[PDB]
UniProtKB/Swiss-Prot annotation:
Morphologically, spectrin-like proteins appear to be related to spectrin, showing a flexible rod-like structure. They can bind actin but seem to differ in their calmodulin-binding activity. In nonerythroid tissues, spectrins, in association with some other proteins, may play an important role in membrane organization. This is Spectrin alpha chain, non-erythrocytic 1. Disulfide bonds: none annotated. The chain holds residues 965 to 1025 of 2477 of the full protein. Like erythrocyte spectrin, the spectrin-like proteins are capable of forming dimers which can further associate to tetramers. Interacts with ACP1. It is found in: Cytoplasm, Cytoskeleton; Cytoplasm, Cell cortex. Belongs to the spectrin family. Residues 4-59 form the SH3 domain. Coiled coil: none annotated.
Amino acid sequence: MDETGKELLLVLYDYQEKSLTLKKGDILTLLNSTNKDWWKVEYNDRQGFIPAAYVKKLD
């Protein structure tokens, strides 16, 4: 959130990574949106993948 230029994401629905555990309301940093359906994201110094459908870009 300090890093200028980074894109923040709002988690809309609780998500438990099958293969990250995110709660509704959590704010993530977008790391990689190369794939349209699965995005690499960052939360509290950890990284993982989440379906793009679970989040909204805050822009």
